[PDB]
């Protein structure tokens, strides 16, 4: 339903941003 995906867009956007940032930083740390 739209209710849970438009009331919770800020938290999910923050979670995805943190997810990609963490993935890329973990990938960089091994260089």
């Amino acid at each position: 339903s739209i209710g849970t995906l438009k009331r919770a867009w800020i938290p999910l956007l923050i979670l995805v941003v943190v997810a990609i940032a963490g993935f890329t930083v973990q990938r960089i740390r091994t260089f």
């Binding site: 800020i10 941003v17 943190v18 940032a21 930083v25």
Partner: protein, 739 residues
């Protein structure tokens, strides 16, 4: 009505003030200072995973010469070719040095041996040198005390007439650089204090109010210093002098920012014509969340800075995170209390001769009516800044960033007069095989290795058991009967491994080993050795390259990757906080873009001023610290301005922009100018690295505050209009009202 927190902080003002005073008093009396704690608990500079560090450790282990990377040189020069009295002095010198065991782990004796004396002595015979290995890795205090001890042993005994003796090498350089830094914080501090006071008197044109603001700044600084010192004293967290320096500077920056924010908001509210209480309540309610968000985002970014793989940055996150937490708590609790008690007592915080908000409303009117031209002009200046960036070179030689009167510098100069190379910074290469190298065939292969390494572009001297003086430019043959010669036995014990499974070559560069070319040369050295051993029975052996050049190459690579990590983390956190505070994706995207553009332009401008005109290249610490401070301070200012804009957007967007300007542009500009010029006062400093950092940060904040933040961001806001708050829906102007 009156929210809980502001009342709880107003009613109990005196108890909170006394609590803070007693807490700081205890923290600073029962604990040493930050600098002493950082001294007693210094940490290494080179990460353990660096191939240079591993190679140095392994070379030391195999030859039983210690497990430390530190080293130093003693150089003898005379007005006449060195004679037998010089030899006697030198022999007594090495005896006295090797007598010590807790400081000098091992000593490398060439000049004594007549076989290698030709390689250990200048061509004209007026100079000689020896290498002693100290105790305690680089950056540790053990190395400093060890080199001080060696220097005193040197100066205790009287030399022959006509010869002087000096101590040199990287160890002496770092130690005496630290001493010079210790002794070079008096006149620059005096001028800093006077510039601070004049600038404050300029901003407030009063003596009492500047006094109160300085009171707040100093109490906050003392609180953070005492807290971090206490936490680090009991080995809870790790510290280093670099961390202490940055912590102090950032503490002053944040403390002055928050103090001016609170005072300015209170003063403006008073100017609007309210009493002495409602003004306190409105300033708290309008600034507290901004302060809290700014502080916590800075703390989070600085903590995430601890996820890297370079000691200069890894050991730096936790101290600043805790320091910023302390600063935020102080500014939130002591601050409002002190304003309340000061304002209640009498007439001390009052506005007079107001001429700032009028001018800033005028510039607001200018920036709302014609956003196109102003935006394009600001972009033009930014491009003028940016185009100088791509041509930018760095320097790793720390010698020429210090005054010329240091004893290490004079020993260097005395070394440069008789030697045609940079013999004070050698390198060592080691090849380790699984069989004995003490026979003719492996000696021929060693000669091949030495010859191949010699022909590298810019390698001047290469010393090896085959050619002790450093010029392997001939055909050669070593018969197997020379191993019986005791002098050859001393040579072997000097170069080959005692078990016979290794050899090492001592390589000296041309010109400056710690410039870009010197750093690039070491990879070529390694490749040349690998190709020289290819096809011979030594094929596939292990190659270890130790020295200072390897250290700096690996440090540079780590620096690049670590800068990327920190940039990504900081930009993500700024985006997140903007999104939370304003609830727009476009606004956060615009602010992030503006920040990146501003940092690029400011660093390009600094490169223009220093690298091109003045002709001296920048260090790299300059880049790191400049970016850290600029990021933090810019995040703070941007967040305050965007929050204030969001506050008064209901009566149209144009009126909102002009009122937000007239209300907070003055405050942000005052804070930016005060800190920028306080950082510009470091130009007159003698030390070039700290002068460079001060100037970079000062110019960065001047450009940021006067152009990027006062003309460029409000112009973008006014130009984009109602699409600056998407996905929220806003009207570009309210319903018309009847006359």
């Amino acid at each position: 009505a009156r929210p809980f927190i502001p009342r709880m902080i107003r009613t109990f003002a005196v108890p909170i003030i006394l609590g803070w005073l007693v807490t700081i008093a205890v923290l600073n009396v029962t604990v040493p200072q930050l600098e002493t704690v950082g001294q007693i608990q210094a940490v290494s500079m080179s990460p353990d995973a660096a191939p240079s560090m591993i190679s140095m450790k392994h070379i030391g282990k195999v030859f039983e010469e210690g497990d430390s990377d530190s080293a130093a040189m003693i150089v003898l020069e005379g007005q006449r070719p060195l004679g037998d009295a010089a030899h006697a002095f030198y022999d007594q010198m090495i005896g006295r040095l090797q007598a010590d065991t807790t400081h000098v782990q091992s000593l490398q004796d060439f000049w004594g041996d007549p076989l290698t004396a030709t390689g250990a002595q200048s061509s004209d015979g007026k100079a000689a040198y020896v290498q002693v290995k100290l105790a305690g890795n680089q950056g540790e205090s053990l190395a400093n005390e060890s080199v001080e001890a060696v220097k005193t042993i040197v100066e205790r005994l009287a030399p022959p007439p006509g010869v002087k003796v000096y101590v040199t090498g990287s160890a002496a350089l770092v130690a005496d650089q630290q001493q010079a830094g210790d002794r070079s914080l008096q006149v620059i501090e005096a001028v800093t204090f006077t510039v601070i006071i004049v600038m404050l008197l300029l901003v407030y044109r009063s003596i009492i109010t500047s006094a109160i603001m300085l009171t707040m700044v100093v109490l906050g600084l003392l609180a953070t210093r005492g807290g971090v010192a206490f936490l680090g004293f009991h080995r809870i967290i790790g510290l280093s002098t670099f961390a202490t320096n940055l912590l102090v500077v950032l503490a002053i920056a944040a403390a002055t920012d928050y103090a001016i924010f609170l005072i300015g908001r209170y003063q403006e509210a008073r100017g609007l014509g309210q009493d002495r209480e409602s003004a306190y309540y409105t300033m708290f309610g309008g600034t507290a969340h901004v302060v809290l968000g700014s502080g916590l985002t800075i703390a989070g970014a600085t903590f995430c800075l601890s996820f890297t793989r370079l000691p200069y940055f890894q050991t730096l996150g936790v101290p600043l995170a805790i320091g910023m937490v302390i600063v935020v708590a102080a500014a939130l609790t002591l601050g409002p209390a002190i304003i309340a008690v000061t304002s209640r007592f009498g007439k001390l915080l009052e506005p007079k001769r107001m001429a700032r908000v009028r001018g800033w409303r005028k510039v607001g009117a200018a920036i709302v009516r014609w956003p196109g031209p102003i935006l394009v002009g600001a972009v033009a200046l930014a491009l003028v800044g940016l185009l100088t960036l791509p041509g930018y070179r760095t320097n790793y030689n720390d010698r020429n960033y210090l005054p010329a009167d240091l004893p290490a510098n004079e020993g260097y100069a005395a070394a440069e007069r008789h030697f045609s190379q940079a013999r004070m910074n050698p390198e060592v290469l080691m090849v380790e095989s699984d069989h004995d190298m003490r026979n003719s065939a492996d000696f021929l292969v060693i000669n091949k290795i030495a010859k191949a390494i010699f022909a590298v572009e810019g390698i001047s001297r290469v010393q090896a058991i085959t050619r002790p003086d450093g010029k392997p430019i001939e055909s050669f043959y070593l018969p197997p009967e020379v191993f019986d010669n005791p002098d050859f036995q001393r040579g072997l014990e000097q170069f080959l491994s005692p078990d016979g499974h290794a050899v090492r070559f001592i390589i000296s560069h041309e010109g400056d080993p710690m410039s870009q070319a010197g750093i690039a040369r070491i990879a070529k050295i390694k490749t040349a050795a690998k190709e020289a051993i290819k096809g011979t029975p030594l094929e596939g052996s292990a190659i270890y390259l130790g020295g200072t050049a390897a250290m700096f190459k690996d440090l540079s690579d780590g620096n690049t990757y670590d800068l990327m990590i920190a940039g990504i983390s900081a930009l993500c956190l700024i985006f997140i906080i903007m999104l939370i505070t304003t609830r727009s994706v476009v606004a956060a995207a615009v602010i992030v873009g503006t920040v990146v553009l501003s940092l690029g332009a400011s660093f390009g401008l600094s490169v223009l001023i220093w690298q091109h005109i003045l002709g001296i290249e920048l260090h790299w610490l300059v880049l790191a610290m400049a970016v850290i401070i600029l990021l933090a301070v810019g995040a703070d200012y941007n967040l305050l301005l965007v929050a204030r804009l969001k506050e008064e957007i209901h009566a149209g967007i144009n009126t909102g922009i002009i009122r937000a300007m007239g209300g907070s542009g003055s405050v942000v500009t005052a804070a930016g100018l005060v800190f920028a010029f306080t950082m510009m006062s470091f130009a007159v400093s003698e030390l070039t690295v700290m002068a460079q950092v001060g100037t970079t940060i000062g110019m960065g904040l001047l450009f940021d505050t006067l152009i990027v933040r006062s003309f460029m961001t409000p112009s973008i806001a006014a130009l984009l209009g109602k699409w600056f708050w998407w996905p929220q829906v806003v009207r570009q102007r309210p319903i018309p009202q009847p006359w």
